[PDB]
Amino acid sequence: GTLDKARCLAFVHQLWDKDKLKMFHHPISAAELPDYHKVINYPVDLSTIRQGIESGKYDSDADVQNAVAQMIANALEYNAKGTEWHQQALSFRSIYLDVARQCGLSVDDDAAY
Amino acid sequence: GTLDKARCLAFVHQLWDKDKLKMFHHPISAAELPDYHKVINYPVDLSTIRQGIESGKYDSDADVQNAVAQMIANALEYNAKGTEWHQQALSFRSIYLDVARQCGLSVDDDAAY
Numbered sequence A, B: 001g002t003l004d005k006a007r008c009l010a011f012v013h014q015l016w017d018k019d020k021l022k023m024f025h026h027p028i029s030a031a032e033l034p035d036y037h038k039v040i041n042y043p044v045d046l047s048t049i050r051q052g053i054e055s056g057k058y059d060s061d062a063d064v065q066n067a068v069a070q071m072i073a074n075a076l077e078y079n080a081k082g083t084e085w086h087q088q089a090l091s092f093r094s095i096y097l098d099v100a101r102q103c104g105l106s107v108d109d110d111a112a113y
């Protein structure tokens, strides 16, 4: 796999604009949610993903997609059913692979979160 | 957030016995599949997960379910659609939470792979 930085930044950018709560824009601090570190082993956010793309940290487009999946899974695990954070996370899970496709990324439909 | 070792081990054992191809029993070695580590960043197998439960490496029942999910995702990514290995992994993705429930574990259906 190759890292297509333009295609990967387009994908993050589309997700950033669809994030109406701005809940995925920045890393979660203990200051914000004191118990978050206790629940979530692999925190990740769209600013951190953009930096990972721009720096070449991700080896492939697939790794960027897996980072977005992880970010969405985190919010579904942490947040109770019915809260706006849980509901936007569910919406993201529903659309993120379509957004990836719409940016020209290859999606493994059977394997994808 | 408590690791329920008996129920997690029971869960791993049920998956072991349902693994007819034995494709999840042991770590994949480069000596058999030299490209495996190139494709798959997060290798995990039922023997490794059993050891992680036994040692208390996993912090929670959720972490054990996520390790099993990653094992299944690995097989769906690595094995081409149409192969018996890809097809068993499709089956496992569709039943692993059902098996977890049969072993008395709680599942997060919205979050789960």
Ligand SMILES: CCOC(=O)Nc1cc(-c2ccc(C)c(NS(C)(=O)=O)c2)nn2c(C)nnc12
Pocket: A021, A022, A023, A024, A028, A074, A075, A078, A079, A083, A085
């Ligand atoms: C019961 C409390 O639950 C939570 O507040 N959960 C979460 C909240 C945020 C979050 C961050 C930053 C902002 C600006 C906001 N926007 S707001 C306060 O208007 O909704 C939200 N992110 N987040 C992520 C990721 N995962 N869970 C959460």
